[PDB]
Write a protein that binds this ligand. Structure first.
Ligand code: FES
Ligand code: FES
Ligand code: FES
Ligand SMILES: [Fe+2]
Ligand SMILES: [Fe+2]
Ligand SMILES: [Fe+2]
Ligand code: NA
Ligand code: NA
Ligand code: NA
Lengths: 359, 359, 359
């Protein structure tokens, strides 16, 4: 190899997408966690998730209908509540007593739908709830532009390695990482970055390329990352938020999603034109990661240099989600920090940048 | 789960389709029973089935030719009789002596081709021969309109559960089952039905919907069902026969077939126009089952109500085909009958029908 | 069955195609031997092969670039020499010391690229080097017209059985084998053939069909065959060379390739017109084998007649490549010859040829 497959899917919150796309006003089928899931909303507009296959004789609940607070199976119309309780068998003398299917705990946060997953079958620790993003509810920000792809032939765990790599900021995103720090603690892993645009990549000048980016990116649990993007072109500031999230479909396939909201420029003219530019731009930055992730294997026992930083400590952090809560080791979870020195690399890269535009 | 896969394919007769489609005058390839099969007719027009792969060096006999009473392998022209005997190697000094491949016992019944399958390798019990349908040879009836699909991702055993379910007649076929009885005995499982058209499903009236259907449906062995359809619209009677049959390709894929013949209306004008309407109509009734079967799992340990009827007894009946003939249990095979009470359901359903057209 | 899958890929030289197609001047991805391979040339134009996945964090080297004598990984630009040595990590203070990936020994012979494979991980025995074909470097011959297909659902070992079969020359290639001899010795298996065109296959005459073909075909190791084709139409001689070669992708899939060069006719008129006819013609002869190979299984325990010749001795020869060099048995490798008597078959076939054109 590199790498024996996980035997479970990770314990945590997984984002299924934009909440308003699961509300129309039918059930939705999602394949996830090696099964099929049914997603549907209440008569109160509250979102529920169940095993997708009817416990009676196997009808696909996602092919059925919402009737009041229950999804009705397409086959014989039995009625399943968001808590999994069989509420009614319409034509029967006696609805089964205290029957239920598996229900999944759900959370709507920042206009996004999350489901909880735990192999051990325990409910969500309140301590690991996904944070609200205030700007998702601001009329001063755009609303989620959201994308999703299916990646086959790898495990979702392959993509989290990005948290820890300073050097790809140059080769993949075409900037110069001038500051690089990782923090792991509890259920959160973070990356803090200062990045400068490269002069040799067509937005130079001189005196007219020169974006500076300050980035904080955090994983809140195993699968969901918020990235706060503050960049500048001199004195022109722009603010954005990129969501990088995934959920496993299989141990060899997963859905990768990304969303972007931007602080609307005031403005102007509508000003939608310029927000599309800001959005498509963060989107293209994400898509440069996808190109790599799409054509790469995971390396279980990597050849590492000092500049790799905290690769092992990050993999140790991520293990916590795959062990029973009772088996979590201090060192998975205790505060770890590392600043990666980017000064030699930056002098090498500036030399290569210089070398390139001397032509 | 629901359900550990069978380790054998069922012992019995399996229909391969309309006999006249296997007669033209070449061999035919069929994948079935986890292998490849070759089908071909005699110089007497008698139909034979063999393992499809030549015992010499593996040529695909279905890619070859019929020469007299033998199929000639495309590779080196060896000649295989319908009983599996190597009859000739044309260029050789000495044809192998008492060499053979596996041959499959065949039956042409009602213009349909059947092959026999038994894991134990024993020949067909005469007691289980598939019955003749006289109307398949009547010029007073239409001839087989026949359809076939490949279902991937399930086992063929999933579809036989339909024999025992009264309630889908309402939700799936949009009628009201007014009488419902099952009989299992020997190698045959039967369903007897009286069904009334629903007023809320656009053929009402009042006084102008109102079909009454009397249905007898029997499985003759594991895979082949004849359904006798007698319905009325007042005094206008119509007669039809639906064949529901399948054969396994793999333990996770099978071919589902259906054929319909109708009693031709006298007539009239040709009268082909009206026979097409009668045929397409039974066909669409079958296709409503297919929609369910296409998007459903089998439930091995189902949540059952009283109205489910004889679900366990039917699964016990079907087991007989998967055990060695010597291991068949009395209770698989002894006469079992159940009438399912449809009176409460029918009052519930009439209320819902009433509720619907009050709008 | 027929046949338990090999547990290794064969020890020997495998042809990857025309060397000039791997030189342009980027790396190439090839799937082979159950992995992914990267192919690239030097700054000296010398061709190298490595494991395709970067040992750092798994980037696909075939998606990267050639920089001097090394392929640069697309992910972080590490630099890998044709011998597998990590030569530089560009941005790092310290390149890893004495780090390497797996490199594959390479050979350019007759304008074709070969890679060496050995489960035991030993280098190429000089004794088994693939011979030069002088005519591949002659301006009196055409240059490689080359074709490649992917065969899924079989093992590459299935096709080598052709070496030993006289009778397919009639049924598959439509000629009459008048002389047939096999020689196995060491790492080489050979077929010597005299073939006459069939009168009943539209190039008769009389006095105007009547090609005579003298053929020598040799496997040099497990996967690569040169076939020298000398045929005549009376006094008009033509010379060609067909390469039949393959490499395994998986134990159930492989790439089959074929190339043809012809002695250019002098000439004439350009004379390219006639060389295309000669080439397309050998190509179509090869393609008649492919039709069989595409629709056939391997038979592990075949029903054989005397006319089958040395089927077992050929399979025993081929075993050598699948055992450890230390475990090769005398009888795999010692000189074996057999002439197959084609006289009775030829009288049978002439009778059938006669029978056919009497119509
Ligand atoms: S299968 Fe769901 S109601 Fe019967
Ligand atoms: S493979 Fe069937 S005749 Fe040789
Ligand atoms: S993955 Fe190849 S250089 Fe890092
Ligand atoms: Fe990135
Ligand atoms: Fe039905
Ligand atoms: Fe051949
Ligand atoms: Na790093
Ligand atoms: Na029922
Ligand atoms: Na032979």
């Amino acid at each position: 190899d590199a790498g024996a497959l996980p035997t479970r899917y990770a314990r945590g919150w997984h984002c299924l997408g934009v909440a308003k796309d699961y509300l129309e006003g039918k059930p939705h089928g999602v394949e996830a966690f090696g099964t099929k899931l049914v997603v549907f909303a209440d008569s109160h507009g509250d979102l529920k998730v169940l095993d997708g296959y009817c416990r009676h004789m196997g009808g696909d609940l996602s092919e059925g209908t919402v009737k009041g607070d229950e999804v009705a199976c397409p086959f014989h119309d039995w009625r399943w509540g968001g808590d999994g309780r069989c509420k009614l068998v319409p034509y029967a003398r006696r609805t089964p007593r205290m029957a239920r299917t598996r229900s999944w705990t759900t959370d709507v946060r920042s206009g996004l739908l999350f489901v909880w997953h735990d192999h051990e079958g325990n409910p969500p620790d309140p301590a690991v709830r996904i944070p609200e993003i205030p700007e998702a509810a601001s009329d001063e920000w755009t609303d989620w532009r959201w994308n999703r792809i299916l990646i086959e032939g790898s495990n979702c765990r392959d993509i989290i390695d990005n948290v820890t790599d300073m050097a790809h900021f140059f080769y993949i995103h075409f900037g110069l990482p001038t500051y690089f720090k990782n923090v792991f603690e509890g259920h959160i892993a973070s990356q803090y970055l200062h990045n400068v645009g490269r002069p040799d990549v067509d937005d130079l000048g001189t005196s007219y390329g020169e974006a500076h980016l300050d980035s904080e990116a955090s994983y809140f649990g195993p699968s969901f990352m918020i990235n706060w993007l503050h960049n500048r072109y001199g004195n022109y500031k722009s603010e954005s938020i990129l969501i990088n999230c995934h959920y496993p479909v299989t141990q060899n396939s997963f859905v990768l999603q990304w969303g972007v909201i931007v602080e609307k420029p005031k403005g102007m003219s509508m000003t939608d034109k310029l927000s599309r530019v800001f959005t498509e731009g963060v989107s293209k930055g994400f898509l440069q990661d996808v190109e790599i992730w799409k054509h790469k294997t995971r390396i279980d026992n990597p050849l590492l240099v000092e500049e790799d930083g905290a690769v092992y400590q990050l993999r140790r952090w991520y293990e916590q989600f795959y062990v029973d809560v009772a088996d979590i080791k201090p060192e998975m979870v205790e505060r770890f920090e590392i600043e990666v020195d980017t000064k030699r690399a930056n002098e090498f890269w500036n030399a290569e940048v210089e070398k390139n535009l001397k032509s």
